Paper text:
Having identified compound 3 as a cooperative [name] with the lowest ternary K d and the longest ternary half-life with [name]-loaded [name] by SPR, we sought to explore its degradation profile in cell lines exhibiting different [name] mutations to ascertain whether greater ternary complex stability for [name]-loaded [name] would indeed improve the degradation efficacy of the KRASG12R mutant. [name] 3 dose dependently degraded [name] in the Cal-62 KRASG12R cell line with a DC50 = 462 nM at 18 h and maximal degradation of 75%, while ACBI3 and 1 had no effect. We next aimed to solve the structure of the [name] 3 ternary complex to try and rationalize a potential structural basis for the improved affinity toward [name]-loaded [name]. Leveraging established cocrystallization protocols, , we crystallized ternary complexes of VCB-[name]-[name] with KRASG12V-GDP and KRASG12R-[name] as representations of [name]­(off) and -(on). We obtained suitable cocrystal ternary complex structures of 1 with KRASG12R([name])-VCB and 3 with both KRASG12V(GDP)-VCB and KRASG12R([name])-VCB at resolutions of 2.83, 2.63, and 2.89 Å, respectively. Analysis of the ternary complex structures of 1 and 3 with both KRASG12R([name]) and KRASG12V(GDP) showed that the same relative orientation as previously solved cocrystal structures was adopted, regardless of the mutation or nucleotide. The main observed difference was the loss of interaction between 3 and Tyr112 of [name], relative to that of [name] 1. Chemically, 3 differs from 1 only at the point of attachment to the [name] binder, where it presents a cyclopropyl 1,3-dicarbonyl in place of the isoxazole of 1. As expected, differences in the Switch II loop are observed between the G12V­(GDP) and [name]­([name]) variants for each compound. Interestingly, for 3, very small differences are also observed in the base-binding loop regions between the two differentially loaded mutants.
Author numbering:
A (entry chain D): 1 to 29, 40 to 168
B (entry chain C): 60 to 207
C (entry chain B): 17 to 46, 57 to 112
D (entry chain A): 1 to 80, 84 to 104
Write the structure that this text describes.
């Protein structure tokens, strides 16, 4: 049985922990044995934290992850602009340029959308990674989001 | 504070790393205290768009041997601020090594460090061989050399 | 302007004076003729190949190729380079 | 495109450059300024084939990728009746040390 170490990163307040809680407990106020494409595998979701710390100890913890979920809230334009900074820090620690990655637009159950889905789709095509719109409250796209990253780690590892 | 160190300008400037050397380039960034930090390597003939900041220092070495490399026909690279968004280019090349230093690289790449003193060369070349290049000894030279 | 460089086995190499001045040892010696009693012909020719390589590629501003050194020549070439200061 | 050559005869070897579009007769004129011998008493060869005074060095087999500065090509020279092309060979390096294998 192959294990997958996934990491959820993003701006402060985008829903990193909420997505992880709902993915595991089906609850909205970390390991899960999942069958993806007929393959039994375990999802080891790492701490989401979010505090800014540029130490070698933090780099060592993030370097262990194989796939990264870059999250932004569709109602917060700043969380979308920060996606570039989060993606570059991921490439720096992983020592690679094509890291298994999936862009995630969280909080799509909200009526104050300030980021067009086409803007994220255009950004996703530029980075060569898939994009998925999710909602931790409604569990919309939450399973589609994490599974899609799992498909990227396998395709990356071939 | 060390003279050779980066400034916390926090102003981003897009840089293009171009490796036109037959070596695997190790981009080394001097932090805000003069301590070198390694970064992802560039295979030969490869180019990568880099996110950096104004006033930050960069140097380039061979990823495996830590030989010296040239950026823009110079050893140190400082990007300015992007003029109207135009990114700044960093063209990594091989330096025209001295025939002595070039021979040292070839001998080091063929003999284990334990068997250096087993070669039919003069006793001085043993010390020259085991004086492997590093960033620390070079940083001391570029520090004292930048005085005006 | 050329100079003559004679090896230990009697091979005379005619290189441009600017190219020969690349080494400090030859610069101190020069007249128009220099002899090396301890440098064989196959090693002195390679040094002249470095001379032509160094003068041509010092002014290049985009990319430089690697200077090839065979394993069978490296040790002899290293001692000659150390003696020539180049 | 520049070509880099080793004009060799007996125990003499000249390190010089030229243009791939330059003439063999022009190269003989370069040997004239170095060894003080006219082109009428010179015969330039590529290996064992005589080079005509009208063809270009490229048309003889000396291109930019065959005559790099770090690996120049070899041109034979014979002086005057002409003599047989004789190029004395360079020395040989010793047996590669057991350590470098
Ligand atoms: N409506 C809605 N609210 C959400 C969603 N995801 C998270 N939230 C809300 O956003 C807030 C932050 O959620 P949380 O998961 O803690 O965010 P985070 O990115 O982990 C914040 P930090 O980085 O500081 O730990 C909470 O008030 C939570 O209820 C979502 O999909 N929909
Ligand atoms: Mg959290």
């Amino acid at each position: 049985m192959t294990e997958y170490k996934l990491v959820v990163v993003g701006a402060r307040g985008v829903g990193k922990s909420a997505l992880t809680i709902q993915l595991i407990q089906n609850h909205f106020v970390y390991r899960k044995q999942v069958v993806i494409d007929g393959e039994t595998c375990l999802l080891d979701i790492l701490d989401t934290a979010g505090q800014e710390e540029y130490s070698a100890m933090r780099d060592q913890y993030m370097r262990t992850g194989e796939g990264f979920l870059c999250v932004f809230a569709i109602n917060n334009t700043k969380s979308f602009e920060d996606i570039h900074h989060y993606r570059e820090q991921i490439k720096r620690v992983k020592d690679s340029e094509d890291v298994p990655m999936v862009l995630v637009g969280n909080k799509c159950d909200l009526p104050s959308r300030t980021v067009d889905t086409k803007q994220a789709q255009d950004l996703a095509r530029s980075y060569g990674i898939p994009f998925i719109e999710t909602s931790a409250k409604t569990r919309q796209g939450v399973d589609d989001a994490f599974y899609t990253l799992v498909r990227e780690i396998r395709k990356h590892k071939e | 504070r060390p003279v050779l160190r980066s400034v916390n300008s926090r102003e981003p400037s897009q840089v293009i790393f171009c490796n036109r050397s037959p070596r695997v380039v190790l981009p080394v960034w001097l932090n805000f205290d003069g301590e070198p930090q390694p970064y992802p390597t560039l295979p030969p003939g490869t180019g990568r768009r880099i996110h950096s900041y104004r006033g930050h220092l960069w140097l380039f070495r061979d990823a495996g041997t830590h030989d010296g490399l040239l950026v823009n026909q110079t050893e140190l690279f400082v990007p300015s601020l992007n003029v109207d968004g135009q990114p700044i280019f960093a063209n990594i090349t091989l330096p025209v090594y001295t025939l002595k230093e070039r021979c040292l690289q070839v001998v080091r790449s063929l003999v284990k460090p334990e068997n250096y003193r087993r070669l039919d060369i003069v006793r001085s070349l043993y010390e020259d061989l085991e004086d492997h290049p590093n960033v620390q000894k070079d940083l001391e030279r570029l520090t004292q050399e930048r005085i005006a | 302007m050329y100079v003559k460089l004679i090896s230990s086995d009697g091979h005379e190499f005619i290189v441009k004076r600017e190219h020969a001045l690349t080494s400090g040892t030859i610069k101190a010696m020069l007249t128009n003729e220099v002899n090396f009693r301890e440098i064989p012909s196959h090693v002195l020719s390679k040094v002249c190949m470095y001379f032509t390589y160094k003068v041509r590629y010092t002014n290049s501003s985009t990319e430089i190729p690697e200077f090839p050194i065979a394993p069978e020549i490296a040790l002899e070439l290293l001692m000659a380079a150390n003696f020539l200061d180049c | 495109m520049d070509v880099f050559l080793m004009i060799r005869r007996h125990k003499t070897t000249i390190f010089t450059d030229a243009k791939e579009s330059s003439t063999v007769f022009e190269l003989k004129r370069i040997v004239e300024g170095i060894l003080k011998r006219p082109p009428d008493e010179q015969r330039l060869y590529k290996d064992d084939q005589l080079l005509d005074d009208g063809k270009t060095l490229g048309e003889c087999g000396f291109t930019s990728q065959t005559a790099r500065p770090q690996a120049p090509a070899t041109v034979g020279l014979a002086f005057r009746t002409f003599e047989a092309l004789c190029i004395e060979p360079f020395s040989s390096p010793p047996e590669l040390p057991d350590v470098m294998k």
